[PDB]
């Protein structure tokens, strides 16, 4: 498998990126609760997930468009990019030197929308990939 291996790697990185997103949200939330509970928040875990996500985006770019339709490949990288630059990077910065209401409003609306868009792109990418492999 050469094309097959490439596809599976694209599916793998895409899944890993989406997973790092959930790790990031969950870890940032934990740290944020400690801040709300009059504590000292440790943002090293969440920053780790954020970086992991960006590195998986770099790994995805190096693999794309690969063997599939270049459009869906373009789609996934631009929505991944957006989720990072407009969602996760600003949301992290709000938790670190922003107000509580600004971080919570952004984390309850802005970042989610970007998440569902990237998630949608990822699901169609993987459905198309899976179909080709199962031919």
């Amino acid at each position: 498998n050469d094309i097959d291996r490439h596809l599976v790697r694209q599916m793998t990185v895409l899944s890993q990126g989406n997973d790092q997103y959930f790790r990031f949200v969950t870890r940032l939330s934990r740290a944020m609760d400690v801040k709300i509970g009059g504590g000292t928040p440790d943002f090293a875990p969440a920053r780790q997930s954020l970086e992991n996500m960006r590195q998986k985006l770099e790994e995805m770019k190096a693999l794309s468009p690969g063997p599939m339709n270049p459009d869906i490949s373009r789609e996934v990288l631009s929505n991944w990019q957006a989720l990072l630059e407009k969602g996760v990077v600003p949301q992290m910065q709000l938790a670190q030197q922003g107000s509580l209401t600004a971080w919570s409003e952004h984390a309850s609306t802005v970042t989610p929308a970007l998440s569902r868009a990237f998630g949608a792109s990822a699901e169609r990418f993987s459905h198309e990939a899976g179909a080709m492999l199962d031919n």
Copy 2:
């Protein structure tokens, strides 16, 4: 192949997590409307709860597969607990109880269950990441 099976499991787990986070937001908006003296629409929250339940069933059907049996088990038990003890009550309580129930249950009981699911999901992602990226030593 092993990579595809792990990835299907990682994808079902993320989808489960996404559907759970959705559920919490979905239900909250329906309650603001109910608290605002309006006619709530529970159809969407029910959809998320049902999607969370469907993703658990799909996770079980794929497990343990190539993943360590202990980690696989932790994930399914914490997922199932979050659903049967956290999520389901909230929904049944949101359709009958008060702030003393749905709001109080959701702030005290659920979080603990949510936190355990998150710890298991981390344990899963870490081992999967090591297998997939040949990162282990």
